[PDB]
Nucleic acid binder design. Structure first.
Ligand SMILES: [Mg+2]
Ligand SMILES: [Zn+2]
Lengths: 113, 204, 145, 80, 60, 99, 128
RNA sequence: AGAACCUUACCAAAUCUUGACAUCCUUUGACAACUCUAGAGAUAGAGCCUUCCGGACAAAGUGACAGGUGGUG
RNA sequence: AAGUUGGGCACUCUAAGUUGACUGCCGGUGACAAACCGGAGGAAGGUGGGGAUGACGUCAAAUCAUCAUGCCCCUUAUGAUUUGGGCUACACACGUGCUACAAUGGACAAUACAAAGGGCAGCGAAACCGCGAGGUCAAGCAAAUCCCAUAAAGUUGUUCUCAGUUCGGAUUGUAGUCUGCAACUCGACUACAUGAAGCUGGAAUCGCUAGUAAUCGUAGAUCAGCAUGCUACGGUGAAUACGUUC
């Protein structure tokens, strides 16, 4: 349990740390190298000092709920300023200049024939 | 549907009409040649200009005009040929040397025959009689085969059609055969009439 | 609309076992031209079956193909039954073997193929079930022959 | 342009028109066709009539609009 | 092509990125080769006439 | 002490005859020539839509092939240089001389 | 010395192959054959001409092979070995020919046709 | 076989009417890249100012005339 | 260190010219014919493999927007210039493709093997800087010389162990690079994070007979920049054709 979130017990530490929101593979490797810990050692077979060092490194990366709040604040700011990206966020359409005549399902939801 | 026979045979048994090489100014040379050819065509309409070859070397342009009426192009005193030389030099900064090649039998030249029949059609002759006489004289002058075609609003009819006449052998699928092809256009009061002529004067 | 029968291809024997059948099984297993992958898979499967049976790999393989090779089939026309050609027998045996092996639940294709050939040698495999169904429907439609 | 090594783009005419009458507090509306001009802090509190294709949409500049283009606040297409 | 458009292409552009190629024989804006400054249609016609040095039909 | 002559031409026939002409001129003038050496031909293919409009699936493929010939003169002489620089080749072939 | 030289071709692969009196070792581009080739089937195919001629292990092979892939180069080497054995003893012609090793496999990659995805594969057709 | 501008043929807005482009006809040049000002520009106002051989060439005015990716395959 | 140079033109290669393949020879089926089958020789055997080449005709098929053109139409506009916006929209239906759903695999490190093209204000080597896309200096090269440009699949080792996952990468946040006067509408790529559907697809339907299909990359035209399209190249490399009932 790191950053208030449980991580798979039987998964290697490097992979299991990716389950933390805001932690991917690159940041997981970087954290693991900063807080010296075997790459292949599973979290279940881990030492309390290693866990404490990992927590110490993680706490300052600005992950999880803080990251979510920052992203939501950015999205809300661009919605509020009445930007083009904000209008597209409100309408649930692609924001990064895709074509909506086809292949916009991940933004427009399921097909409504 | 039919490959242009000249296009099919260029580089196999027919040499290019543009004989030169370039690596950098290919486009400028090509379009200079194109404007030279366009000016020669516009200026020597009356002359039976069968075709024109262009070569360039040592900053010179050698023009070879194969025509059927060399007297008209040269002039009695060389005045016409000198004037043409001067106008080509005006068009192109380079120095142009012009030669004229006589065609003994103008009735065996595809381009000349096409232009003659197109002129007759403009004069409003019979699109059948013109082709018949063309083919007759070409065949009597020893041609192994000839084909003529005229398409468009033949007798002014609203519905355009084509009609063709043939005699002898014209093996358009033989790559050996040196088949002379030409297309011309008559600008009749009803519009464009396209005449095509294929001539096969035999193995050479 | 066909002038007649065309010549048939002839494959070389397996370099190690010297078996046309083995070569054609490797070709069947091969996907996208990965002949090396097919070779390693087949060889690992042969080693696994040899270990698990204490019996010659080629022997058990030949017994499995003999078990899963049919003799009658049915072609739509109602389905009319007809005998199967000797080369069609081998083709169908290998094709069914590979298909049901790929359909097995083992983790790796080598394990799937080994288990499937073992089951076919015991006469209790998916390919055996396929052959049995084919023979049953051929017998059911025997009249239309 | 976008690259940091080049400064944020803005039309010189637009920038000088904004700078003009900066001291006076009776700031007026600035007609502009420059949808591509970036919004600098100098633009805060200004009104730009930005051409969107057929008409000049008025746009009021605030602090949160700094760093964006003037075109991002004058939509061009109409739907429903 | 339009004569005014040909003229606007010939004339100098205030931008430099605003320069585009047109076939110099007919004026077609699309499918113009750089080596010949010709569109595909004019290229085919002149190759058939044999007036493009060294250009012949290909096959292999 | 070598002189390179590079000839390039769209016609292998004309390039071969020009190469023979220059080799003969050099051997007459007296120098010794190693060659001609045929460098790999450079073929540029152009694919055009045959139809004026639509009909994408129908194409026509032209080529321009330039053949390349290399000549090495080993023992140059003033006579050889004068004869090479005075020799006139067919308009088709392009000749470059590197002394 | 006593070198028996020969050339072999397959696809776009050319192997100059030289046979010398030796113990059967094969060197390819200054590398061992069992390292250069990624599979032992290729080595067996290379040795096949020697088995046919009944001179297995009586020659060391030196290969300068470029072009194509590993299979193409292996079969080019086999062709070169067969040609070298021919050069060394004309009596092996019958055995090599029966084995089918003196044949230069003429199969090459078919050009792509315009209007087709590949040499033969055509675009997916849809009536209506 | 290459739509951010151009392309581009469509739309809005700001603009021109021998015209963006061609030939003839009258005058004759220093035309015009270049710097200033106003404009989103196109363009307008004064300078600077540099070319030219019996005439190439290039500017101003007028009338013929130009122009159309407008229709009918 | 290197075919790097001294040397050689053996080999390969390059590209001109030539030889070769014609049912030629032999034996069967066949009406001693044609032809089919098999064999010898040959690198190649049965139009060896492909390309170009497309008759007389059919669809008043497409194109007046490549070009030309009869007639009609506008000419203070249906002509012309410029800035900005459309052509990139989006409750939807269809065609063609790219990416996947995984263990014949994902990730990590090491190490091989192609062919065909392009390069003048263009190909940008090495070196230094940045994790990165890229930036500074800058050699060579108008080409069998230099560069683009280390191919990938593959092979060998470690790890995951059948999980919507170490699969898959859409979606969006932030921060960069590059081209262009200018990436808002509306470029590509890069770093970090986010991590949707999808766990081989109903009716139906498509391509392909061999170096073919399938997979893997590579290059080029257009082009400042922008390719999952198009046109070429090679690497690995199958299955099946009984038959003409439908
Ligand atoms: Mg033919
Ligand atoms: Zn054109």
């Amino acid at each position: 349990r790191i950053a208030g979130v449980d991580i798979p017990r039987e998964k290697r530490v490097v992979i299991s740390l990716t389950y933390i929101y805001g932690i991917g593979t690159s940041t997981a490797q970087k954290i693991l190298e900063e807080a010296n810990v075997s790459a292949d050692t599973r979290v279940k077979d881990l030492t309390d000092d290693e866990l404490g060092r990992i927590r110490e490194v993680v706490d300052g990366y600005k992950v999880e709920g803080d990251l979510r709040r920052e992203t939501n604040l950015n999205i809300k700011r661009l919605m509020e300023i009445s930007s083009y990206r904000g209008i597209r966020h409100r309408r649930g359409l692609p924001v990064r200049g895709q074509k909506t005549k086809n292949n916009a399902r991940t933004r427009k939801g399921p097909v409504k024939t | 549907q039919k490959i242009n026979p000249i296009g099919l045979r260029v580089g196999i048994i027919r040499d290019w009409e543009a004989k030169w090489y370039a690596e950098k100014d290919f486009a400028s040379l090509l379009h200079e040649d194109l404007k030279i050819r366009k000016f020669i065509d516009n200026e020597l309409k009356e002359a039976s200009v069968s075709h024109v070859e262009i070569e360039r070397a040592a900053n010179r342009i050698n023009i070879a005009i194969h025509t059927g009426k060399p007297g008209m192009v040269i002039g009695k005193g060389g005045s016409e040929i000198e004037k043409l030389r001067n106008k080509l030099n005006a068009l192109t900064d380079k120095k142009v040397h012009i030669n004229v090649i006589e065609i003994k039998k103008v009735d065996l030249d595809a381009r000349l025959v096409a232009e003659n029949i197109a002129r007759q059609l403009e004069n409003r002759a019979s699109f059948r009689r013109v082709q018949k006489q063309a083919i007759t004289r070409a065949m009597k002058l020893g041609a192994k085969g000839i084909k003529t075609q005229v398409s468009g609003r033949l007798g002014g009819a609203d519905i355009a059609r084509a009609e063709q006449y043939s005699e002898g052998t014209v093996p358009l699928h033989t790559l050996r055969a040196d088949i002379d092809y030409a297309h011309a256009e008559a600008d009749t009061t009803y519009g464009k009439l396209g005449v095509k002529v294929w001539i096969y004067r035999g193995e050479v | 609309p066909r002038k007649g029968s065309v010549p048939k291809r002839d494959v070389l024997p397996d370099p190690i076992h010297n078996s046309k059948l083995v070569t054609k099984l490797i070709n069947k297993i091969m996907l996208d031209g990965k002949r090396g992958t097919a070779q390693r898979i087949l060889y690992s499967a042969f080693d696994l079956v040899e270990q698990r049976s204490g019996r010659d790999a080629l022997e058990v393989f030949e017994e499995a193909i003999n078990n899963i090779m049919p003799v009658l089939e049915v072609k739509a026309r109602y389905q009319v039954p007809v005998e199967v050609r000797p080369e069609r027998r081998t083709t169908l045996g290998l094709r069914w073997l590979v298909n049901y092996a790929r359909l097995r639940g083992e983790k790796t294709m080598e394990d799937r193929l080994a288990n499937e050939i073992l089951d076919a040698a015991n006469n209790t495999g998916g390919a055996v079930k396929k052959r049995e169904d084919t023979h049953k429907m051929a017998e059911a439609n025997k009249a239309f022959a | 342009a976008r690259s940091i090594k080049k400064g944020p783009f803005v039309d010189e005419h637009l920038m000088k028109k904004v700078e003009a009458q900066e001291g006076s507090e009776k700031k007026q509306v600035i007609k502009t066709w420059s949808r591509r001009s970036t919004i600098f802090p100098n633009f805060i509190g200004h009104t730009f009539a930005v051409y969107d294709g057929r008409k000049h949409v008025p746009v009021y500049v605030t602090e949160d609009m700094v760093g964006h283009k003037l075109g991002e606040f004058a939509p061009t297409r109409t739907f429903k | 092509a339009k004569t005014s458009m040909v003229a606007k292409q010939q004339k100098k552009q205030k931008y430099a990125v605003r320069e585009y190629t047109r076939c110099e024989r007919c004026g077609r804006p699309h499918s113009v080769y750089r080596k010949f400054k010709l569109c595909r249609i004019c290229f085919r016609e002149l190759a058939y006439k044999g007036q493009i040095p060294g250009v012949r039909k290909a096959s292999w | 002490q070598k002189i390179r002559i590079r000839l390039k031409a769209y016609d292998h026939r004309v390039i071969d005859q020009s190469a023979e002409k220059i080799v003969e001129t050099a051997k007459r003038s007296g120098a010794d020539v190693s060659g001609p050496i045929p460098l790999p031909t450079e073929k540029s293919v152009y694919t055009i839509i045959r139809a004026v409009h639509k009909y994408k699936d129908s194409r026509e493929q032209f080529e321009q092939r330039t053949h390349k010939r290399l000549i090495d003169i080993v023992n140059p002489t003033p006579k050889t240089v004068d004869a090479l620089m005075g020799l006139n080749l067919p308009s088709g072939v392009d000749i470059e001389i590197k002394l | 010395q006593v070198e028996y030289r020969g050339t072999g071709r397959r696809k776009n692969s050319v192997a100059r192959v030289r046979l010398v009196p030796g113990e059967g070792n094969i060197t390819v581009n200054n590398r061992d054959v069992r390292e250069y080739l990624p599979f032992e089937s290729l080595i067996l195919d290379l040795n096949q001409p020697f088995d046919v001629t009944e001179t297995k292990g009586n020659y060391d092979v030196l290969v300068n092979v470029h072009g194509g892939g590993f299979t193409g180069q292996a079969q080019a080497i086999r062709h070169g070995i067969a040609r070298a054995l021919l050069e060394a003893d004309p009596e092996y012609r019958g055995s090599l020919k029966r084995a089918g090793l003196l044949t230069r496999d003429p199969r090459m990659k078919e050009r792509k046709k315009p209007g087709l995805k590949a040499a033969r594969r055509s675009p997916q057709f849809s009536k209506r």
